[PDB]
Symmetry: C3
Subunit: 103 residues, 3 copies
């Protein structure tokens, strides 16, 4: 049940939430360009996951807390269904986040 796969500090940040339904912790997040808010990462593009949710949401919150850095265990993250294995590997590329198999 280990969440990290590396020792680099895992810093958190807050942001405006566009999530409108319950969402578990360790969900990757992306920006919604129409609103500028953070929503669940849809898996469509590598590099567009900009955060990993820290606290579960109920879907009513205007703000959320996310990890903006750290190295996560791949298996701990709640990935979107259907995600492409390469886009999953490189979900966070370009941010300070990364992930790796423990395994």
């Amino acid at each position: 049940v280990r969440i990290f796969a590396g020792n680099d500090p895992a810093h958190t940040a807050t942001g405006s939430s566009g999530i409108s339904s319950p969402t578990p912790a360790l969900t990757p997040l992306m920006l919604d360009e129409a609103t500028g808010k953070l929503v669940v990462w849809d898996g469509q593009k590598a590099g567009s996951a900009v955060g990993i949710l820290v606290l579960p949401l109920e879907g009513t919150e205007t703000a959320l807390t996310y990890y903006k850095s750290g190295t996560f265990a791949t298996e701990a993250i709640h990935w979107p269904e259907x995600v492409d294995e390469h886009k999953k590997a490189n979900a966070f590329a370009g941010s300070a986040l990364s992930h790796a198999a423990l395994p």
Copy 2:
């Protein structure tokens, strides 16, 4: 007059500047895609602010210094006029920068 709202190290970087007028410190920056240079963040998109200016510019400089990490106090940053509250909250999402209300 506190500039930071968190303890994560605030690292700086240098970059090529496209700014041609005086600009105060703690201004968010974006890339200009036509030139590749750093300019003032226009507020149009969340996640496109890639830096926060460290030293004031006069507008003649070919290079600038910017913060590439850290957690800033929202009120300390010199935001662009008109900015959308959500795009402002998520200005830096995807970078190692973030900001929060002290308040």
Copy 3:
């Protein structure tokens, strides 16, 4: 032969590789949007270099290791031929990476 130009920790990450030919260490990387894999940064856009290769590749590897943070010496990096001086200066803007002249 110094590779770093600053003291901020240089963290590494792994990612899915789309590189199919030998590639030296300290090569900047970008995402290929069609596949989601990491490939050599082509120099076309500032901010699209998301990593710097840590280990040389032979071109057969499905995964690679890259730096996701740190301040590099400009001269140590293996830049793409033809790169624009401004796009080169700002190659990594928006990531936790940066570079500077030692010189």
